[PDB]
Amino acid sequence: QLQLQQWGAGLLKPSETLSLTCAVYGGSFSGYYWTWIRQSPGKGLEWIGEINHSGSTTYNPSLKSRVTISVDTSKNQFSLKLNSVTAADTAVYYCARGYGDTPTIRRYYYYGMDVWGQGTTVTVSSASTKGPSVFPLAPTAALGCLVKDYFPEPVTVSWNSGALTSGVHTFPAVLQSSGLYSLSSVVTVPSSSLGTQTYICNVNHKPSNTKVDKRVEP
Amino acid sequence: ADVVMTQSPLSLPVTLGQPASISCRSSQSLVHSDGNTYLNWFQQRPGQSPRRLIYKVSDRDSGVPDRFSGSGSGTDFTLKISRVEAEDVGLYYCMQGTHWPPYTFGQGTKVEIKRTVAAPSVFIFPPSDEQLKSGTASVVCLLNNFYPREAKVQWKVDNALQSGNSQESVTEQDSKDSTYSLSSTLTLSKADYEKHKVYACEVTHQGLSSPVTKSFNR
């Protein structure tokens, strides 16, 4: 079957230009529209634009003033450039195979958003790299760790170096108004385990070389 | 004028093995001048690209289980799952390929696993003494292992209801017990924290016949 592999930087600052590329394998480069689509929690799925083998583009009217889509037939690749980005452009971006590029193919062939790239997670933010401050949430009992004010994603959170996994909930990161992320991780344990067992949250943030082992106790 | 695609319901809890039905209406006829009706359905499993299940209303993509079927005409469309199985949890979208640009998607339907009502065990956590030095305070309210998803938290500080000073996060449905957990995070500018004494969050859920409250003071 046809396969699409995509790449490009996903961590951007406002006013930068998003630049993604998609390579095509396992099928002809002709016969159908090369397509870009994005997905964000807020707006769902949005068609950005398309291009054919011959270089003819069609864009989404709400984006057309900031979109360029191009094709390189000597490499079976196609590209997206989205200029002047803001936080509102934060999304997962996909390349895909569109409908047949003639009336006949469109009418009689199965093609039409049926093959997709793996996606590129794109975040737009003015923030510089910052490591988290880690605070304990002290106490069947519950306890955990507040992991505050970091950029970029992700942090990794474990408990007692991976030994503790049962009853653990690590919440998804929230973007704070400051432009930095925050999350919490919690565990429930038997109340009788407090006098016998020690709990430590291990929080790693590779970008800032942050490594914190925060004990959580009564 | 862009074609509006309206899916229903936004959330669909299904009992395992039971049928499931997703609606999609368009604001304009989807019948194309070439006589075809261009309506597709997608399944998206977490962290993966959308997968096309159905194209041109009722044509099933190859490799797709026959428990999936699409139907309808004109402006009214329906995806049906005869027997919902474990691997069918996730997001489903319709897409019209008749009027473009732009192609438009539905806002998505989240298929989740229905189980019996489970009340949240609630825990409240005070700001840490280590955090208060940074000139800000965070009070966390935890609602653990509850079903269904729909919950309500209200912050009380000196018995005053708060507004807009809190962010929520939810876990994905647990793989083993099918429950949720939720964090509520109270953000205070320290001065507002020491100014008041008694802290409490009040959780309202289906599983509780009456709002439960955890508390502390300092």
Residue numbers in the entry:
A (entry chain A): 1 to 139, 148 to 226
B (entry chain B): 0 to 217
Sentences from the paper on this structure:
Signalling initiated by antigen binding to B-cell receptor (BcR) immunoglobulins (IGs) is of paramount importance throughout the natural history of the disease. Recently, a cell-autonomous model of CLL cell activation was demonstrated whereby BcR IGs from both stereotyped and non-stereotyped CLL cases could promote Ca2+ influx and nuclear factor-κB target gene transcription without the addition of exogenous antigen. We demonstrate that BcR IGs derived from both indolent and aggressive CLL cases interact homotypically via their combining sites, binding to distinct internal epitopes in each subset of patients. These unexpected BcR–BcR interactions are sufficient to initiate intracellular Ca2+ influx, and mediate stronger affinities and long half-lives for the receptors derived from anergic B cells from indolent clinical cases, while weaker and short-lived for the aggressive ones.
In both CLL183 and CLL240 Fab crystals, the molecules form a lattice characterized by specific intermolecular interactions involving the VH CDR3 loop of one receptor and an articulate surface comprising residues from the heavy chain framework region 1 (VH FR1) and the CH1 domain of a second Fab. The Fab surface areas buried on complex formation (558 and 597 Å2 for CLL183 and CLL240, respectively) are within the range for antibodies in complex with their specific, high-affinity protein antigens. Distinctive features of the interaction are a salt bridge between the CDR3H residue Arg107H and Glu16H from VH FR1, the insertion of the side chain of Tyr108H in a hydrophobic pocket, hydrogen bonds and van der Waals' contacts between residues Tyr109H, Tyr110H and Tyr111H and the surface of the CH1 domain. Using analytical ultracentrifugation (AUC), we observed that both Fabs from the CLL183 and CLL240 receptors displayed concentration-dependent association in solution. Next, we engineered and expressed in recombinant form two mutants of the CLL183 Fab designed to disrupt the intermolecular interactions observed in the crystal structures. No self-association could be detected for either the CLL183 mutant Fabs Glu16HAla (mutated at a key amino acid of the epitope, indicated FR) and Arg107HAla/Tyr108HAla (bearing a double mutation in the paratope region, indicated CDR), thus confirming that the contacts observed in the experimental crystal structures recapitulate the actual interactions occurring in solution. Similar effects can be seen by the Gly31HGlu mutation in the heavy chain, since the germline-encoded Gly is present in the CLL183 receptor, while the mutated Glu is present in the CLL240 IG. Indeed, residue Lys214H, whose side chain in the IgG CH1 domain forms hydrogen bonds that stabilize the self-interaction, is not conserved in IgMs or IgEs. We engineered a chimeric BcR where the constant domains of the CLL183 BcR IG were swapped with the murine Cγ1/Cκ pair.
